[PDB]
Write a protein that binds this ligand. Structure first.
Ligand code: HEM
Length: 85
């Protein structure tokens, strides 16, 4: 996986490209964005910060982890990941 800092993810704050750093692991649900029963403006609404907060809020099933696999992108820089602290 490529270590991209928010400097990049930030550029992925749109429909075409919308990720959500969760558990230090950013996911590219820009594809399954429409396949998500959540929304289209709520998934991207957090396409810049941490969605894990909102993602964990709704309380996603434990079988959701296996859900997104191919969509996954990797994990933003580990140095920047500790910066979001
Ligand atoms: C990329 C990973 C994600 C996957 C694989 C995923 C998967 C799912 C699935 C299968 C549902 C149905 C069951 C459930 O989990 O409640 C759902 C619902 C939902 N998801 Fe996600 N989700 C993801 C990320 C997010 C994020 C980042 C948000 C927003 C912060 C979000 C918000 C919601 C909401 C609001 C619901 C609908 C629950 C209800 O009826 O109120 N999800 N998600």
């Amino acid at each position: 996986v490529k270590y991209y800092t928010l400097e990049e993810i930030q550029k992925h704050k749109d429909s075409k490209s919308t990720w959500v750093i969760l558990h230090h692991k950013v996911y590219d649900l820009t594809k399954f964005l429409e396949e998500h029963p959540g929304g289209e403006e709520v998934l991207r609404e957090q396409a810049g910060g941490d969605a894990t907060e909102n993602f964990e809020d709704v309380g996603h099933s434990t079988d959701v982890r296996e859900l997104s696999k191919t969509y996954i992108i990797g994990e933003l820089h580990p140095d920047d990941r500790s910066k979001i602290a």
